[PDB]
């Protein structure tokens, strides 16, 4: 449970955990899809794909190393996993690919074979992964004409028109030092890694900063992707949430836990202590749903997602759910808040502490990049337990009560009523 | 023949002012409530066979 981080030339961050069996090293950049443009959208996803290409991947495999990378909105990360002993051979492969081979990975035979893969990849996504496709579109309309609206995997149109020069252009503007953090998780010590790094000098484009832009903003709107040939209806709905490093980051995350997630087929799920289940189970209004409090640097999204085959009662699904959310402003109970506290701790635990160093790396790098440090799991619990009913009520009265929303859906959505109908349910009549 | 004359015209002035105002106000309210549908936009992308 130690968050160690020191700066010499490069800001090095590590979180050691003795019993681990393995160790992971890599760099995480403070720039992701939210830094691209509508036309070069998909560059970051492309980088990730070449970094994992058959050529580069075969080199580290001989050495007994494994590769992993993830593209997000605010950040990007390249990671190399290894045994606790080869904690040095990872640092060689890292520098070899980001300085020496930052021109060998971009050959006219590799880039074309990779481009052909992300194209079949992103296409496959839009053709079949409906729930994620919808959540991606939710960000698209909620933050339109603003950074957060750009899909992480990029659009098929900005992708097929992307050239090697664009990769370089992006890389030379974001893969800088002042916008980077070298992460090390697994078992290796902070002082073990920091030495192998402060050994090899060379700055490589120092003093350079990435370009700036215009702040992200929420806009009440919707995008309806009707498709009557699909067998279900997938919809996502949300209000403007909380950004990371916000006084209410936790109240919000707790508020989502109150309604939580559900799966109509799993017996135990049907028994949960969520009032909403009394309303939706009578006529079986949906196969599943899940609330969330997504947070980013400039903004966030608080809402839920759901999938259903009861295409003639979608208005009741949406109506009941939004009536429950009304309660957070006027009648949420102590026991509901308490049930949430326990469950939030359990999930926040399983995330920050799993048996996989790669997840730890991403989380560590991402956090240190936005707030210059990581909040310890124990420090979180103290904040979570401190939340009162009054807090939830004040938060909801600001974020949920009579506030614009964003909607997105695909499939048999004829039954999803108009905007103003849904919008009206964000409140209740009173004397 | 019309003993109510003076009174009738006074009541008329009140009635016409309220209804006029109500009429104008309703138009504004209607336009607001309709703005989402009015400015709504569509795009067609022919599905592949």
Swiss-Prot record, chain A:
Domain of life: Eukaryota
Coiled-coil stretches noted in the UniProt entry, renumbered to this chain: none
GO molecular function: metal ion binding; metalloendopeptidase activity
Keywords: Electron transport, Membrane, Mitochondrion, Mitochondrion inner membrane, Respiratory chain, Transit peptide, Transport
InterPro entries found in the cross-reference section: Metalloenz_LuxS/M16, MPP/UQCRC_Complex, Pept_M16_N, Peptidase_M16_C
Single Gene Ontology BP annotation: mitochondrial electron transport, ubiquinol to cytochrome c
Subcellular location: Mitochondrion inner membrane
Membrane-topology annotation of the record: Peripheral membrane protein
GO CC annotation: mitochondrial inner membrane; mitochondrion; respiratory chain complex III
Family: Belongs to the peptidase M16 family. UQCRC1/QCR1 subfamily.
Free-text function comment from the UniProt entry: Component of the ubiquinol-cytochrome c oxidoreductase, a multisubunit transmembrane complex that is part of the mitochondrial electron transport chain which drives oxidative phosphorylation.
Subunit and interaction comment: Component of the ubiquinol-cytochrome c oxidoreductase (cytochrome b-c1 complex, complex III, CIII), a multisubunit enzyme composed of 10 subunits. The complex is composed of 3 respiratory subunits cytochrome b (COB), cytochrome c1 (CYT1) and Rieske protein (RIP1), 2 core protein subunits COR1 and QCR2, and 5 low-molecular weight protein subunits QCR6, QCR7, QCR8, QCR9 and QCR10.
Protein name as it appears in the record: Cytochrome b-c1 complex subunit 1, mitochondrial
Native organism: Saccharomyces cerevisiae (strain ATCC 204508 / S288c) (Baker's yeast)
Swiss-Prot record, chain B:
Ranges per topology, Mitochondrial matrix: 39-49
Consequence of substituting residue 38 to L: Loss of CYT1 and COB from the bc1 complex
TM ranges: 5-38
Protein's cellular compartments: Mitochondrion inner membrane
Protein family membership: Belongs to the cytochrome c family.
Role summary: Component of the ubiquinol-cytochrome c oxidoreductase, a multisubunit transmembrane complex that is part of the mitochondrial electron transport chain which drives oxidative phosphorylation.
Miscellaneous field: Present with 39900 molecules/cell in log phase SD medium.
Quaternary context: Component of the ubiquinol-cytochrome c oxidoreductase (cytochrome b-c1 complex, complex III, CIII), a multisubunit enzyme composed of 10 subunits. The complex is composed of 3 respiratory subunits cytochrome b (COB), cytochrome c1 (CYT1) and Rieske protein (RIP1), 2 core protein subunits COR1 and QCR2, and 5 low-molecular weight protein subunits QCR6, QCR7, QCR8, QCR9 and QCR10.
Protein's UniProt name: Cytochrome c1, heme protein, mitochondrial
UniProt lineage: Eukaryota, Fungi, Dikarya, Ascomycota, Saccharomycotina
Residues of the full protein shown: 259 to 307 of 309
């Amino acid at each position: 449970a130690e968050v160690t981080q020191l700066s010499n030339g490069i800001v090095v961050a590590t979180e050691h955990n003795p019993s681990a069996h393995t160790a992971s090293v890599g760099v995480v950049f403070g720039s992701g899809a939210a830094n691209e443009n509508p036309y070069n959208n998909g560059v970051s996803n492309l980088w990730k794909n070449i970094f994992l290409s058959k050529e580069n991947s075969a080199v580290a495999a001989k050495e007994g190393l494994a590769l992993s990378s993830n593209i997000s909105r605010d950040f990007q990360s390249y990671i190399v996993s290894s045994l606790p002993g080869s904690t040095d051979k990872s640092l060689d492969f890292l520098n070899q690919s980001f300085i020496q081979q930052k021109a060998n990975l971009l050959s006219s035979s590799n880039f074309e074979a990779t481009k052909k893969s992300v194209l079949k990849q992103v296409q496959d996504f839009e053709d079949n992964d409906h729930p994620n496709r919808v959540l991606e579109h939710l960000h698209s309309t909620a933050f339109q004409n603003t950074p957060l609206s750009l899909p992480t995997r990029g659009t098929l149109e900005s992708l097929e028109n992307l050239v090697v020069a664009d990769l370089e252009s992006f890389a030379n503007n974001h893969f800088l030092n002042s916008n980077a953090v070298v992460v090390g998780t697994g078992n290796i010590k902070h002082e073990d890694l920091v030495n192998s790094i402060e050994s090899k000098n060379l700055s490589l484009q120092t003093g350079t900063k990435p370009v700036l832009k215009k702040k992200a903003a929420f806009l009440g709107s919707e995008v309806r992707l009707r498709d009557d040939t699909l067998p279900k209806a997938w919809i996502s709905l949300a209000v403007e949430g909380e950004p990371v490093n916000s006084p209410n980051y936790f109240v919000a995350k707790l508020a989502a836990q109150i309604f939580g997630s559900y799966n109509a087929f799993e017996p135990a799920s049907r028994l949960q202590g969520i009032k909403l289940l009394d309303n939706i189970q009578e006529y079986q209004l949906c196969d599943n749903f899940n609330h969330f409090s997504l947070s980013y640097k400039d903004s966030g999204l608080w809402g839920f997602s759901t999938a259903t085959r009861n295409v003639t009662m979608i208005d009741d699904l949406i109506h009941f759910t939004l009536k429950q959310w009304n309660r957070l402003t006027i009648s949420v109970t102590d026991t509901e808040v308490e049930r949430a506290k326990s469950l939030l701790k359990l999930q926040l635990g399983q995330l920050y502490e799993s048996g996989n160093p790669v997840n730890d790396a991403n989380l560590l790098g991402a956090e240190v990049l936005i707030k210059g440090s990581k909040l310890s799991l124990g420090e979180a619990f103290k904040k979570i337990d401190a939340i009162t009913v009054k807090d939830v009520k004040a938060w909801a009265g600001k974020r949920l009560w009579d506030q614009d929303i964003a909607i997105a859906g695909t499939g048999q959505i004829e039954g999803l009523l108009d905007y103003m109908r849904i919008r009206s349910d964000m409140s209740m009549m009173r004397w | 023949a019309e003993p109510e004359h003076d009174e009738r015209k006074r009541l008329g002035l009140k009635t016409v002012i309220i209804l006029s105002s109500l009429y104008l106000l309703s138009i504004w309210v209607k336009k607001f409530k309709w703005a989402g549908i009015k400015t709504r936009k569509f795009v067609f992308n022919p599905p592949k066979p």
